[PDB]
């Protein structure tokens, strides 16, 4: 069915706008919005279709004190959207309280596109973790759309703040938002700034204007992850069947992402599979290993070569991973997109459950604990104190993510007959 | 056609053949082969280009070998009485009405009125008939649409059972969900993952089984210019679909049909149960898990 | 030209002619003509066209013309007006159905088949097939307006639904209208639901 | 039968003149009036036909202190009309009293064209609500032609004054004129300035010279609404059968208007129907919804496609409206006009009963009430005081329009078995 996307945060609104620019380049529309007669493709799961010849993308544009949204206005894509949902803090708790006081009218904006379409499948949350304006508010609406509708699917697009230590309040914020993503979202697509910055410094020569480049990298990822849904495949071409294969344990819903062209600014399948398994073509940063991998192909692919290629990785002993179930590596095939200039014809995807990211989590679980011993880096905001007078909800969230780390460490081994 | 233009030449050869006092095979072959080449070319000249043979094969594949997935998800979603017995007095009209309505949902405003849904449950009696343009294509006989419909019904059954299991997966989405729930019989050793796999893997196999031959068959038609060759290529295509899809009478085919009805019984139990509750599901569940182990031992007969 | 004049003498200008007869003598109608059932009308067509047009073809025009006058009678009987409010509620329960029937008869029958028929009659290469293409308009228009098949199982209820406009016209009681409406409308529907299958376009009303 | 049009107000006389210009471009006449031999069409319901080769439009031209009528004279259409009816206030009551004192000679002008033609069907009133010179006088003659002739039909062309708050006496005037339109007219065609100004700013770049553009928009509407009467259709090609289908309740006779070309300065029927149902192609500004819609088509239209198109809107769930009767949506077909340059060949109409306009009414019912509490904005005119010493007729009109609002709010629901 149809999928509604919601973007908040300034960085989130930017990457949502660039994503819709990428899809306007993808789909049979002009940059004004008007249909082009050159075109197979479906424009229904992400675009509301009138006959106003300007098919409006199904995006909910919310903000706090619009600054970059003015720059979103000065563009030729100002005729692509106008659903009139633009409305005028610093912490998780302050942003949570500010989202608390105005919940009725933003939820009326949600109920508007809920009543606008008749079929409903999923909500994509475009959000940055511990981002200030995004944090607190995004966790609040995440709680509310899961509590209000238990029949739909919740997916999230999320980056990870990592700068190798400055914001001293970030481990509290990420800790609480990770609780809310684990208990109020069914699947989370995890990215970080650091690995994409590393790959960007690898391909280009960039130090200062990194943001403008990594946005392009992210948008290529999010378009690629939706090519199987927008163009009709037969495997996991709905969101529900896609997420139903990727979760072996209901606490594990974090998906690793890669992309086989590391630079785009002939091939057989075993080549791109082996290039795919390398950690440098991976976009997300003791024995730590995958539980189950799904890889998705896009290009001119002969069908018998994929069988030989999977046989090749079986013979390589590149499978030095060992979970406790026979749920295995997964191949899928979709077409490369027509209708646009398409360089580097065959390109790959991976969607995998990897426990190396738990190290990333425990770094946050390290940092907050140190600040919890010092008690000088909570910054003592007034709404933060009124919202929780004892600050034991952060301690309870630390307990939940500690159980999450123990369940990860049990999921690494082939012994999960007992709970971890 | 150039049949009238080279008519007098073939006439001169056959007139020369009567004057010769001796019968030899060597000349008689030459005259019949020389006529055969140009007449098969005459059929090939029309059927490929102005009847769009290569274009019609994708339409056959899309509506028929389940090469489309939008209609054959939307149709099974809006049909609920073909799981029960039909009287075939009301339902035979209702299925094509629902078919064109489901086709209307996204695109398909260009024609899509040539098919017809006939009934002889109501899935096993459902049949798709596709009337072809008989003077413009004699390659598509009654016999080939007959073999083709066996492929259609068998792939519909697989589509139904895998849609059922992937929709009934809501353990993560609703049933653990702001719920704590002591789980020692609420788990069933999560065999839902296993019953997916035996329907998933065959599935991937089907993607090869269609695509390798379909790429070849739209290739051979380009190379040759006599219709007789395309006949051999097509009669190899159909047999490969049958044999690779395991439709042929085997113990293995019986085993695959048993896998399918076992998955349907699994889906019925987990659909009716609900979010966490004991309704004496243990007996049916025990029968099911033992039967799944028994049939999974039978699938190892082919692995050895 | 005589065909274009012929099909313009049924179905504008002639509606005002019938509405005066609504508000009876047989010679007073004649001078107005030169400006529930039972009427006769015909015209002189010259001899070189009387070898394609026939004598029973005049009769088929008369029968279909009379059945058009009955639908115009129904539409004007609901046009005669512009218990407190309960009468108006029984109007909307009626005004829907009958209007759809009129909307079916003009557009879907007498304007589709006529527009189809004009595109064929200019393709006449012969005297014989002109007569043939004319008769396969006559014998199917006498089928589409139902006067030759299952007329005591379908057409009788179409005769019964026009009586509700008469009872609505008399009162100027009310419950005896909706009882007969919910009788005859379902009695139409419970017979046509088996189905030529075009009859669902007026019975979704 | 024949239909007589009456225009008053300066704005009303302007749009009547532009409407006759549009019909002179439509009909087989020259701008001097002389017949052109290029021409199917009927010039009898709006044009008196002599053999003076200048067919005189059936318009009654009344005025107060002619200013813009001099500009009407300096035109090549001064030979189209001369029925000699030009004759030399600020409020509803002052204009009503001024119309009271001279009723005999203007009613002699009415009796003149009444005796001029033998068949009579309807009177169109071209009038602006609370327009000054139009207000008071137009309501007075509206009362008089309904009281004098109960066998004919009364239609009105009317715009709504809305400027989002300046004239402080407008809610009194519009309140009284709305009473007179509800009780002394059988159908009212309602327009507003604000939605046409919004559509005009959408299509063009106009801020100051808006009047000259919106007149063209209005005239295109009034010509389009008369194309089914001037050119012989078979459905509602008289006024009486047209209005007899559109009124489900005798207090509701206000018709919503739209136009499918939003700019004119290929198509199938489902396209223009879906474009038609959008509120941006609509020209008139809790659950509020239509009771019954009539849409009229003009163009090259295949007959079977309209049936499929109506089936399409039935399947869309664009019918989220629910009155208490089975009186349904309505399609009609008329031809596109020959004999003139006709761009944008297929164009649509809607004639619909919508209750959103009641909000517009209650804004006036808000404003007057506030001024009724203040008692400093009635402006205390002497004829206004003599005409009503207690000003309780405005209070009675407020009671009538309050009952009108309650009947609207009852008509919205599927429960109108009891009176509202």
DSSP per-residue string spanning A162-179: ------SSHHHHHHHHHH
Annotation-wise, does D28 bind a ligand? no
What does the DSSP assignment read for B88-117?
A: SSSHHHHHHHHHHHHHTSSS--S---SEEE
The gap from C-alpha D375 to its chain's centroid, in whole angstroms, comes to: 33
**Beta carbons of D388 and D348 less than 8 angstroms apart:** no
Task: Round to whole Å and give the CA distance between B162 and B198.
Answer: 10
Q: Does the CA dihedral D357-D362-D365-D371 come out positive or negative? A: negative
First and final CA of chain C: distance in angstroms?
Answer: 38
What is the CB neighbour count within 10 angstroms for residue C130?
15
Which residue does chain D place closest to A118, by CA atoms? D317
Q: Residues of chain D whose C-beta is under 8 A from some C-beta in A?
A: 271-272, 274-275, 278, 280, 317
Instruction: Burial-class residue D230 by CB neighbours within 10 Å (0-12, 13-18, 19+).
Output: buried
Task: Round to whole Å and give the CA distance between A8 and A14.
Answer: 9
Task: Round to whole Å and give the CA distance between C61 and C46.
Answer: 17
Q: Do chains D and A touch (3 or more CB pairs under 8 A)?
A: yes
Touching chains, C (3+ CB pairs < 8 A) = D
**Which of D327, D330, D331 is closest, CB to CB, to C92?**
D327
Q: Residues of chain B whose C-beta is under 8 A from some C-beta in D?
A: 101, 104
Task: Decide if D275 and A50 are in contact by the 8 Å CB cutoff.
Answer: yes
- Resolution for this experimental structure (Å): 7.0
Task: Round to whole Å and give the CA distance between B163 and C113.
Answer: 46
Which residue does chain A place closest to B199, by CA atoms? A235
Q: Which structural technique was applied?
A: cryo-EM
Task: Decide if B101 and D315 are in contact by the 8 Å CB cutoff.
Answer: yes
Which residue does chain D place closest to B101, by CA atoms? D315
Q: Does the CA dihedral A220-A226-A228-A232 come out positive or negative? A: negative
| D185-211 CB burial, b ≥16 within 10 A, e <16 | bbbbbbbbbbbbbebbeeeeeeeeeee
**Beta carbons of A257 and A350 less than 8 angstroms apart:** yes
Q: Does the CA dihedral B170-B175-B180-B185 come out positive or negative? A: negative
Task: Decide if A333 and B208 are in contact by the 8 Å CB cutoff.
Answer: no
What is the CB neighbour count within 10 angstroms for residue D293?
21
Query: Known binding site: residues of A?
Result: 130-136
**A52 vs D contacts (CB less than 8 Å):** 275, 278, 280
Task: Decide if C89 and D416 are in contact by the 8 Å CB cutoff.
Answer: yes
Coil, strand or helix: which one is A102?
coil
How far CA A54 is from CA of A30, A31, A69, B41, in Å, comes to 9, 10, 20, 49
Cβ pairs bridging C and D (under 8 Å):
60
Annotation-wise, does D5 bind a ligand? no
Q: What are phi and psi of B125, to 5 degrees?
A: -100, -5
Annotation-wise, does D33 bind a ligand? no
Annotation-wise, does D135 bind a ligand? yes
Task: Round to whole Å and give the CA distance between D312 and D318.
Answer: 9
Touching chains, D (3+ CB pairs < 8 A) = A, B, C
**Beta carbons of B243 and B56 less than 8 angstroms apart:** no
What is the CB neighbour count within 10 angstroms for residue D261?
17
**Beta carbons of A285 and A360 less than 8 angstroms apart:** yes
**Beta carbons of C57 and C138 less than 8 angstroms apart:** yes
Task: Round to whole Å and give the CA distance between D204 and D295.
Answer: 27
Task: Round to whole Å and give the CA distance between B90 and D353.
Answer: 39
Which alpha helices (DSSP H) does D317-356 contain, by range? none
Task: Round to whole Å and give the CA distance between A343 and A337.
Answer: 11
Beta strands A347-354 and A254-259 are antiparallel
Coil, strand or helix: which one is D6?
strand
Task: Round to whole Å and give the CA distance between C165 and D389.
Answer: 51
Q: What are phi and psi of D352, to 5 degrees?
A: -135, 150
What does the DSSP assignment read for C168-190?
A: HHH----HHHHHHHHHHHHHHHH
Task: Round to whole Å and give the CA distance between D405 and D288.
Answer: 13
Give residue D379's region: left, alpha or beta (phi > 0; psi -120 to 50). Answer: left
Task: Round to whole Å and give the CA distance between A278 and C143.
Answer: 75
**D316 vs B contacts (CB less than 8 Å):** none
Q: Which residues contact D66 (CB under 8 A, 6 or more apart)?
A: D86, D88
For residue C93, the distance in angstroms to the closest alpha carbon of chain D comes to: 6
What is the CB neighbour count within 10 angstroms for residue A15?
22
Coil, strand or helix: which one is B243?
helix
Coil, strand or helix: which one is D113?
helix
Task: Round to whole Å and give the CA distance between D83 and D85.
Answer: 6
Q: Angle at CA C88, nearest 5°, toward C84 and C89?
A: 100
Task: Decide if B207 and A333 are in contact by the 8 Å CB cutoff.
Answer: yes
> Most B CBs within 10 Å: which of A51, A186, A234, as the mutation test of the B interface?
A234
Touching chains, B (3+ CB pairs < 8 A) = A, D
- Helix axis angle for D303-316 and D269-277, nearest 10°, is 40
C136 touches chain D (CB under 8 A): no
What does the DSSP assignment read for A145-211?
A: HHHH-SSSEEEEEEE--------SSHHHHHHHHHHHHHHH-SEEEE--HHHHHHHHHHHS--SS-HH
Task: Round to whole Å and give the CA distance between A189 and D4.
Answer: 71
Which secondary-structure segment (H or E) carries A350?
strand A347-354
Return the DSSP state at D238: S
- Helix axis angle for C86-105 and C175-192, nearest 10°, is 30
Task: Decide if B101 and D312 are in contact by the 8 Å CB cutoff.
Answer: no
Instruction: Burial-class residue A236 by CB neighbours within 10 Å (0-12, 13-18, 19+).
Output: buried
How far CA C61 is from CA of A257, B137, B264, C3, C111, in Å, comes to 76, 45, 62, 12, 16
Coil, strand or helix: which one is B169?
coil
**D260 vs A contacts (CB less than 8 Å):** none
Beta strands D122-128 and D59-61 are unpaired
Which secondary-structure segment (H or E) carries D93?
helix D92-101
Which residue numbers in chain A precede an interruption (C–N > 2.5 Å)? 39, 88, 165, 265, 285
Q: Do chains C and D touch (3 or more CB pairs under 8 A)?
A: yes
What is the CB neighbour count within 10 angstroms for residue A358?
20
**Which of C12, C97, C102 is closest, CB to CB, to D232?**
C12
Q: Which of D72, D137, D83 is nearest to D114 (CA)?
A: D83
Task: Round to whole Å and give the CA distance between B127 and B150.
Answer: 9
Which alpha helices (DSSP H) does D299-392 contain, by range? 303-316, 357-374, 382-387
Q: Which residues contact D168 (CB under 8 A, 6 or more apart)?
A: D371, D377, D379
**Which of D234, D327, D419 is closest, CB to CB, to C106?**
D234
How far CA A164 is from CA of A87, A90, A92, A215, A374, in Å, comes to 34, 21, 21, 21, 20
The neighbouring-strand residues paired with D349 are D259, D296
**Beta carbons of A68 and A10 less than 8 angstroms apart:** yes
> Most D CBs within 10 Å: which of A44, A50, A51, A79, as the mutation test of the D interface?
A51
Which alpha helices (DSSP H) does D185-238 contain, by range? 193-203, 210-230
Which residue numbers in chain C precede an interruption (C–N > 2.5 Å)? 11, 23, 35, 82, 172, 195
**A117 vs D contacts (CB less than 8 Å):** none
Annotation-wise, does D133 bind a ligand? yes
**D271 vs B contacts (CB less than 8 Å):** none
How far CA B252 is from CA of B158, B294, B297, B300, D265, in Å, comes to 16, 14, 12, 11, 71
């Amino acid at each position: 069915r149809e999928i509604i996307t919601l973007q908040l945060g300034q960085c989130g609104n930017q990457i949502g706008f660039e994503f819709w620019k990428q899809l306007c380049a993808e789909h049979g529309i002009s940059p004004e919005g008007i249909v082009e007669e050159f075109a197979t493709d479906r424009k229904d799961v992400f675009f509301y279709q009138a006959d106003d010849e300007h098919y409006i993308p199904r995006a909910v544009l919310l903000d706090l004190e619009p600054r970059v949204i003015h720059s979103i206005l000065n563009s030729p894509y100002a005729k692509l959207y106008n659903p009139e949902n633009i409305y005028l803090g610093n912490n998780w708790a302050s942003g949570f309280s500010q989202g608390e006081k105005i919940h009725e009218d933003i939820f009326d904006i949600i109920d508007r596109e809920a009543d606008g379409s008749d079929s409903l499948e999923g909500f994509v949350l475009c959000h940055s973790i511990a981002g200030g304006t995004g944090s607190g508010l995004g966790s609040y609406l995440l709680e509310r759309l899961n509590d209000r509708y238990p029949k739909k699917l919740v997916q999230t697009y999320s980056v990870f703040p990592n700068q190798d230590e400055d914001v001293v309040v970030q481990p509290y914020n990420s800790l609480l938002t990770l609780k809310r993503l684990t208990q109020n979202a069914d699947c989370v697509v995890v990215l970080d700034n650091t690995a994409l910055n590393r790959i960007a410094t690898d391909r280009l020569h960039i130090q200062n204007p990194s943001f403008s480049q990594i946005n392009q990298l992210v948008s290529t990822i999010m378009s690629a992850s939706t090519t199987t849904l927008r163009y009709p495949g037969y495997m996991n071409n709905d969101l529900i069947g896609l997420i139903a294969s990727l979760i072996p344990t209901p606490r594990l819903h974090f998906l690793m992402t890669g992309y086989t062209p590391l630079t785009t600014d002939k091939t057989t399948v075993l080549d791109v599979m082996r290039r795919l398994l390398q950690p440098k073509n991976v976009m997300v940063s003791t024995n730590h290993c995958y539980i189950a991998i799904l890889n998705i192909i896009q290009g001119e692919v002969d069908p018998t070569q994929v069988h030989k290629s999977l046989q090749r990785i079986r013979e390589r002993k590149l499978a030095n991973f060992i979970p406790w179930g026979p749920a295995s590596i997964q191949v899928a095939l979709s077409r490369k997109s027509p209708y646009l200039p398409s360089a580097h014809r065959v390109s790959g995807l991976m969607m995998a459950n990897h426990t190396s990211i738990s190290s990333l989590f425990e770094r946050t679980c390290r940092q907050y604990d140190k600040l919890r011993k010092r008690e000088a880096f909570l910054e003592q905001f007034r709404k933060e104190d009124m919202f929780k007078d004892n600050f034991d909800e952060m301690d309870t969230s630390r307990e939940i993510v500690q159980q999450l780390i123990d369940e990860y460490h049990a999921a690494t081994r082939p012994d999960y007959i007992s709970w971890g | 056609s150039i049949l009238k233009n080279q008519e007098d030449t073939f006439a001169a050869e056959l007139h020369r053949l009567k004057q010769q006092p001796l019968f030899s095979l060597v000349d008689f072959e030459q005259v019949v082969d020389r006529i055969r080449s140009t007449v098969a070319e005459h059929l090939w000249k029309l059927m490929v280009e102005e009847s769009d043979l290569l274009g019609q094969l994708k339409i056959i594949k899309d509506f028929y070998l389940l090469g489309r997935g939008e209609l054959f998800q939307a149709f099974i979603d809006t049909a609920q009485h073909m799981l029960k017995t039909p009287p075939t007095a009301v339902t035979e009209h209702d299925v094509n009405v629902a078919f064109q309505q489901s086709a209307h949902k996204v695109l398909l405003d260009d024609d899509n009125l040539l098919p017809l849904l006939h009934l002889t449950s109501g899935w096993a009696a459902l049949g798709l008939s596709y009337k072809v343009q008989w003077p413009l294509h004699i390659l598509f006989t009654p016999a080939v649409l007959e073999k083709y419909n066996v492929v259609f019904k068998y792939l519909l059954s697989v589509r139904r059972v895998q849609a059922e299991l992937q929709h009934c997966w809501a353990l993560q989405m609703q049933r653990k969900h702001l719920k704590s729930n002591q789980t020692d019989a609420i788990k069933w050793r999560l065999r839902n993952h296993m019953a997916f796999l035996v329907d998933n893997l065959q599935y991937y196999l089907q993607v090869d089984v269609l695509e390798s031959q379909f790429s070849q068959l739209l290739h051979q038609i380009n190379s040759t210019r006599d219709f007789e060759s395309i006949r051999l290529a097509h009669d190899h295509f159909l047999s490969n679909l049958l044999a690779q899809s395991f439709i042929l009478l085997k113990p293995v085919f019986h085993c695959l049909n048993e896998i399918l009805d076992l998955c349907h019984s699994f889906c019925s139990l987990v659909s009716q149960n609900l979010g966490p509750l004991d309704e004496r599901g243990a007996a049916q569940l025990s029968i099911l898990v033992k039967g799944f182990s028994r049939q999974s031992s039978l699938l190892f007969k082919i692995l050895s | 030209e005589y065909l274009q004049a012929m099909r313009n003498f049924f179905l504008d200008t002639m509606y005002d002619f019938y509405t005066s007869i609504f508000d009876q003598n047989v010679s007073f109608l004649n001078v107005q003509l030169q400006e529930l059932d039972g009427l006769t009308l015909s015209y002189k067509v010259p001899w070189p066209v009387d070898i394609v047009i026939s004598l029973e073809c005049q009769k088929i025009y008369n029968q279909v013309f009379l059945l058009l006058l009955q639908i115009k009678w129904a539409k004007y009987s609901l046009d005669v007006l512009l218990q407190i409010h309960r009468m108006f509620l029984l109007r909307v329960k009626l005004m829907h159905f009958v209007n759809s029937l009129h909307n079916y008869i003009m557009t879907r029958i007498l304007h589709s088949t006529g527009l189809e028929f004009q595109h064929q009659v200019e393709e006449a290469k012969d005297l014989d097939q002109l007569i043939k293409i004319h008769y396969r308009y006559l014998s199917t228009i006498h089928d589409r307006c139902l006067l030759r098949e299952k007329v005591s199982f379908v057409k009788e209820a179409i005769m019964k639904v026009l009586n509700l406009a008469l009872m609505f016209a008399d009162g100027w009681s009310i419950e005896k209208m909706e009882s007969d409406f919910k009788n005859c409308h379902m009695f139409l529907v419970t017979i046509l639901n088996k189905a030529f299958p075009h009859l669902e376009s007026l019975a979704l009303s």
